[PDB]
Amino acid sequence: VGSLNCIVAVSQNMGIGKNGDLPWPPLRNEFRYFSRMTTTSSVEGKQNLVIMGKKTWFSIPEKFRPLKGRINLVLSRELKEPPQGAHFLSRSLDDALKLTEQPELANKVDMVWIVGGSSVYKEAMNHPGHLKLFVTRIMQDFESDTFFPEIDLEKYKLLPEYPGVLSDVQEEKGIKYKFEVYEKND
Ligand SMILES: COc1cc(Cc2cnc(N)nc2N)cc(OC)c1OC
Numbered sequence: 001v002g003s004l005n006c007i008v009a010v011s012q013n014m015g016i017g018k019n020g021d022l023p024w025p026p027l028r029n030e031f032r033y034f035s036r037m038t039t040t041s042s043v044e045g046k047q048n049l050v051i052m053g054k055k056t057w058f059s060i061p062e063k064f065r066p067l068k069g070r071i072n073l074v075l076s077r078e079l080k081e082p083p084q085g086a087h088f089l090s091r092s093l094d095d096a097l098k099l100t101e102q103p104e105l106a107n108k109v110d111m112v113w114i115v116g117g118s119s120v121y122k123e124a125m126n127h128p129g130h131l132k133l134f135v136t137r138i139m140q141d142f143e144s145d146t147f148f149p150e151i152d153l154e155k156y157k158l159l160p161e162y163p164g165v166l167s168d169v170q171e172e173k174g175i176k177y178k179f180e181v182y183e184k185n186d
């Protein structure tokens, strides 16, 4: 298995969701960026794995579930099988990464992308190891009911640039946003 990563878009007041929808108007190029980063695998003959909680999975419109060209794993203790269209189910983040080491996935998975929601972000972010955060800063306040966990800048270093990540300010639908990459290793 390659690198472990979170990827998120977040408003200025830290909001990542409002009733399981985007707090902001849909940004098509911001979504393109999400699909590119998560789908692109270095290693030939492998796909990236995406890991998400159950609410995050059910927040995706049906036409976009599973995320195509990526292996989809949902986290849940209540579910007893992967939801319709998903590939894998695990009880917890720890268990999902342990699986990634079994024979049915060890040779299949390149990068792992945690795509939410806020409790799965929080445990990944607080767990020791090499982890990057791909964070889009939406530079406006948007009403939200779910939030990104605090980024501890003592541990996470913001990278001065990163291949395939535009560094300058973007704007769609009248909303300015920018891409950032953070990296810890502890
Ligand atoms: C969990 O699945 C998806 C989530 C999102 C939200 C999202 C959007 N942008 C960024 N940078 N990160 C995110 N996590 C965007 C998506 O496609 C644009 C997803 O695939 C269906």
Ligand SMILES: COc1cc(Cc2cnc(N)nc2N)cc(OC)c1OC
Residues within 6 Å of the ligand: 020, 021, 022, 026, 031, 059, 060, 061, 063, 064
């Ligand atoms: C591309 O993936 C998403 C797209 C949208 C906006 C959207 C875009 N197209 C359609 N048909 N329905 C929608 N709700 C909304 C989302 O979250 C509610 C998505 O999940 C990350």
